[PDB]
Design a protein around this nucleic acid. Structure first.
Lengths: 90, 85, 119, 126, 207
RNA sequence: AAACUUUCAACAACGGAUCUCUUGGUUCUCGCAUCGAUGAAGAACGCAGCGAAAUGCGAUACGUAAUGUGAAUUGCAGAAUUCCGUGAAUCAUCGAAUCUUUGAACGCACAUUGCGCCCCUUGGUAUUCCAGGGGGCAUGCCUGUUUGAGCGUCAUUU
RNA sequence: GAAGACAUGUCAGGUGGGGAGUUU
RNA sequence: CGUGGAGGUCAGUGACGAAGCCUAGACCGUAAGGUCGGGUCGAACGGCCUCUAGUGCAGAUCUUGGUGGUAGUAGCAAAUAUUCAAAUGAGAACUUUGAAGACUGAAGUGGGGAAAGGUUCCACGUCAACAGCAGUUGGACGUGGGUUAGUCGAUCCUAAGAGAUGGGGAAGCUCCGUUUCAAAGGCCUGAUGCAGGCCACCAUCGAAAGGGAAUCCGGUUAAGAUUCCGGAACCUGG
RNA sequence: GUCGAAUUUGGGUAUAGGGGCGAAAGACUAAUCGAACCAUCUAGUAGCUGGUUCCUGCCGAAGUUUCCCUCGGAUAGCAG
RNA sequence: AUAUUGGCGAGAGACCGAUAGCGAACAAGUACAGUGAUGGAAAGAUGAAAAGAACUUUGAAAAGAGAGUGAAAAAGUACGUGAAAUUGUUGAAAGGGAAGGGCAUUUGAUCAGACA
RNA sequence: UUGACCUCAAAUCAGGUAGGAGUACCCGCUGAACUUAAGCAUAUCAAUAAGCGGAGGAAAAGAAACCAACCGGGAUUGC
């Protein structure tokens, strides 16, 4: 079963830029680090448990800390964002 | 006869020089150019006519103003005059 | 050979006009000799001198007009920036910096802080 | 070897740049070395050739000849030296299209700009 | 180019038995009119099976296989027999593998490194390079492949204190780290047993 | 035996085939976003001392203005004068000018360098006619200024 | 003046080699 | 076995001659092919282990280019026809002059014109390219000159017809409409700010043979004229 | 054959492709018409005609068994 | 973070190398054909320097023979190297309505090698 | 009789904007056939070819009337 009864040749994409894209990403990261020199370049993320029991056994990183978690930690969501702590209201 | 005698009466003219392009494609009866689309505001062009597009695409002519835009952008569209050291 | 632009810059408008008239007369006289002489390369210098005088006069007039419109809003378009159509219509520096009072208060209260993970 | 990415080792690019270099850039291309005596005097190895300079031929059939430069043919990349000519069949004399890279300068034309250049290049004229 | 050989409006004239049925170019009064097109055997037409960019250029090789190949290449250097057959002037060197003091890594200038290599028995190998320099044969000279030369000794170091830059300019000589040894450098041309000059720190760190 | 047909070897004839190079072509990768009514692209016509084509330029016309290098351009003539220089370059750079008609093309048209209107200035003794020069008159829509219409309609009244 | 809740966008029934695809 | 390239190697060959080509010259292998001798030639190429492919031609009425027999052959036979003397020229039937003989026979092989062609028009020099022979000549080649308008045409007006505008459809490129269901113009002229007054209709293009405001003769160039010069009139705006 | 007319014709205008036109022949529609030309889908579709390029050594066939709108495909055999 | 057969400025390719590679390595979207939408080519190389044959002679001239530059004129503006098809001159051979080929030898020409 | 409010006009009014070219990428509309199924209409070709409208270096989308049924995941986009 092969799906090639279309003009697939017009949509063929070859990732020649794999090395070039990697170099650009590394250069971009360094550029931001220079721009973000005082900060660690990323926001701390929470501990999260996954759905889909096939994966719930493994802990995973979340998008951001909940409002209740931030409040219990002894700060505020607005201050947390400026301090570098990811916040997720959902 | 459809042969050579028919060609004898070929003394009239259907097309004429076009004001916009002057390619001799301005029809007299229709008062329109079949090549550049005159007098229609939009220049006539089509994707199926790849060769036709090249013959009239930008850069084929003089490019009196567009040719200098790159240098001005490189200089940041600076204004004034040189400080002379 | 040829009229120097800086020398002309020190002359007055009437002097520039007189010099232009004299150069035009000289160019006309030389052209009469060109059709007789086998070759008259000297004609090139006077033709460019006329252009230099005209450019100097135009520059002086434009600079005078600029003073006539110095600091006045809604000035002649030709004196305005020639950057490009898109940039001309783009929001100005002040317009792009417009921030609502709510956002101003939010930024003032909680501006981005400089923090490092050291201890 | 090549390190910076702003330069290229492509043969075609270099050939096109050399054969299409503008007259202003061809001045640097048409440079000649100075004699060891001049090197010790001014403390410099080479300088761009000038029409009023004197150069000694050190290569080719005309080796050993010397004279003042007559003209600098930047268009032809060659240099003409006074008295370095070949006689045609009809007796006409034509200059020899020499190259500054094959000649040694014996005396410089110390123009003000040239004087500044020598000092600019770490020279020792004064 | 995918568009090469197809930028024409040639059409077949049918099987009227006066000329081949190859699609002939239209128009007239230009010479090209009436010429065949779109054929692989036709002049100026698209070649048979035009080359495509999605051809498999890179080849995947197992990591364990790569490590095995590197280890095998390393061993050939210590035999002292494959090196001679490879074409390295290791006849007069004291012993194989060659181990040099850690001070070799701290050499600053190229002249000092060249002198040290000459004194440590690499003089013959260094002289082998710069003597075989010959112009490339064939069309390869068009694409910057002009000059070719034989490989020189390979210096292995544990720390980069300037040795890599000192030996950069000397022709044929190459430098590599123990933690980043290359099979291509160790066995150029699929031939094992390249002459390698190990340093004390590099030799100890190999364990 | 000569004449004539054919093969080989040397040389010489259409031919440019083989070999060697290419300011050339094709593919990948990298960095950026910069056309136009403040008149885009394109097109017609002209500009060099000697130029047909290319390129550049637009009656300031293979260029004008400003800055960098400092001794040319070159096929011939010519000028060189600027050669210890506020200065030669078919030089580079380029922020200042010119930028014919046409072209979204914009006074109306256009197989016509055709046919109109407004303002300023000049001459023919002319506000009325003609002519020379300069500045203007295209369509859709937005904010504001002015002048108007609608027993749509309010108070104000005689 | 005549006319007028009638004539005058969406589905459904009829006719439709005037026109299109296909089979023989 | 052989070819275009790549990794390695021979510290390979090479301006005291690389490659290619010619060579009833030779050697090796059953063969694909490899090597050497000589001539030409002028700047890169060579043995071997591997990798790589746009890698091997006698056919496809195969694509481009070039060249033979047919062949110095068919043919250069419509339109009645040329001949003698002189001149230029190296060269003359075709060029120029003189003479003779003929043709178009006014519905001509003449004098003008529109469309068309656009410098073919005239002057000087030339015969390498063309005038299916030839050519001193040419609508050929190289260098120059020539087109003069108030009175001739375009320009102005309108027919078939084309064609915007306010609007009506169309997702849209754009289709319909020429007064249709528009608040659609400035003209007389007085103290030009403001007063009085008539008309009802409202782009534009569309003929060098439709209509039209007006010039006739004489002379003149190598080539222009009713346009240029002499003379004599006419029409329009003032 | 006709030649005082349903005459011939110059310029302009209108009719443009499943359309136009046709005193009507599938006749004309720019030497192309029972459906014009230009560029793209398109290197369209074949159970069909033709071609399919260097050397040597070894081995080495087949026309019958079944099915298929079957009188080109699957299948056993031969054989490697 | 993602796409990019267009524009600008660059770095590279186990890519092609004048019938190849973009149609265009060159005054290429040029010459040229069509009213037209469109179609659409062929064409790189002297030598390092033109140093491009001054000069004598034959010929009207084109050009040839001498002389000269150049390393080369077997580089002469028809120019790097210079193949086959086809053609001419010189040397050899054969030929009574075909030629060409195979085994075999005579005659003519030509040719390599080594000799206590 | 005078001055206002609402609508609608005229302005070569003062200050502005829009057409168009390019279009490889994007955002929408519109939109086939050849071919394939050894015939062919469902279907494939294809939500493609052509045509039309709209901007930028990216465009679009974007902070869930979402996914899950979990010990819950937590803007959008890409591999």
């Amino acid at each position: 079963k092969n799906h090639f009864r279309k003009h697939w040749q017009e949509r063929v994409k070859v990732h020649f830029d794999q090395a070039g894209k990697k170099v650009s990403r590394r250069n971009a990261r360094a550029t931001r680090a220079a721009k973000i020199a005082p900060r660690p370049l990323d926001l701390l993320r929470p501990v999260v448990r996954a759905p889909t029991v096939k994966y719930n056994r493994k802990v995973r990183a979340g998008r951001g800390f909940t409002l209740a978690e931030v409040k219990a930690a002894g700060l505020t969501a607005a201050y947390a964002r400026t301090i570098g702590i990811a916040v997720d209201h959902r | 006869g459809k042969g050579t005698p028919s060609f004898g009466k070929r003394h009239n003219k259907s097309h004429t020089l076009c004001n916009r392009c002057g390619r001799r494609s301005f029809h007299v009866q229709k008062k329109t150019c079949s090549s550049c689309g005159y007098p229609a505001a939009k220049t006539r062009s089509y994707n199926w006519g790849a060769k036709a597009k090249r013959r009239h695409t930008t850069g084929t002519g003089r490019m009196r103003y567009l040719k200098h835009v790159s240098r001005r952008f490189k200089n940041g569209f600076q204004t004034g005059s040189a400080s002379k050291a | 050979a040829g009229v120097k632009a800086y020398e002309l810059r020190t002359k007055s408008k009437e002097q520039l006009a007189s010099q232009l008239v004299d150069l035009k007369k000289e160019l006309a006289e030389l052209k009469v000799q060109k059709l007789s002489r086998p070759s008259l390369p000297k004609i090139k210098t006077v033709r460019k001198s006329i252009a230099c005088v005209l450019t100097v006069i135009n520059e002086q007039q434009r600079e005078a007009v600029r003073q006539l419109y110095k600091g006045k809003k809604y000035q002649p378009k030709d004196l305005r920036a020639k950057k490009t159509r898109a940039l001309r219509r783009a929001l100005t520096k002040f317009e792009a910096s417009q921030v609502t009072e709510k956002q101003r208060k939010k930024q003032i209260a909680f501006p981005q802080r400089k923090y490092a993970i050291k201890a | 070897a090549k390190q910076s990415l702003d330069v290229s080792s492509d043969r075609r690019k270099a050939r096109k740049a050399y054969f299409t270099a503008p007259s202003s850039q061809r001045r640097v291309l048409l440079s000649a070395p100075l004699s060891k005596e001049l090197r010790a005097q001014y403390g410099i190895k080479a300088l761009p050739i000038r029409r009023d300079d004197e150069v000694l031929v050190v290569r080719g059939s005309k080796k050993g000849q010397e004279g003042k430069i007559s003209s600098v043919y930047r268009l032809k990349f060659a240099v003409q030296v006074d008295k370095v000519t070949k006689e045609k069949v009809n007796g006409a004399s034509v200059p020899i299209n020499l190259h500054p890279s094959k000649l040694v300068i014996t005396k410089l034309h110390l123009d003000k700009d040239r004087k500044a250049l020598i000092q600019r290049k770490g020279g020792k004229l004064e | 180019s995918e568009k090469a050989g197809h930028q024409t409006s040639a059409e077949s004239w049918g099987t009227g038995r006066a000329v081949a049925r190859i699609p002939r170019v239209g128009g007239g009064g230009t010479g090209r009119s009436g010429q065949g097109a779109f054929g692989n055997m036709c002049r100026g037409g698209r070649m048979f099976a035009p080359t495509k960019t999605w051809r498999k250029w890179n080849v995947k090789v197992n990591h364990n296989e790569k490590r095995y190949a590197t280890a095998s290449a390393i061993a050939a250097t210590a035999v002292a027999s494959l090196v001679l057959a490879r074409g390295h002037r290791v006849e007069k060197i004291p012993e194989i593998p060659l181990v040099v003091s850690t001070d070799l890594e701290s050499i600053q200038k190229t002249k000092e490194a060249v002198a040290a290599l000459k004194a440590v028995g690499a003089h013959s190998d260094l002289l082998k390079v710069l003597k075989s320099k010959k112009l490339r044969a064939g069309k390869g000279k068009y694409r910057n492949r002009r000059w070719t030369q034989r490989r020189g000794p390979l210096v292995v170091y544990a720390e980069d204190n300037g040795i890599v830059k000192a030996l950069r300019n000397v022709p044929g000589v190459e430098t590599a780290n123990v933690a980043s040894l290359n099979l291509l450098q160790l066995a150029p041309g699929a031939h094992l047993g390249r002459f390698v000059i190990w340093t004390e720190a590099a030799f100890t760190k190999l364990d």
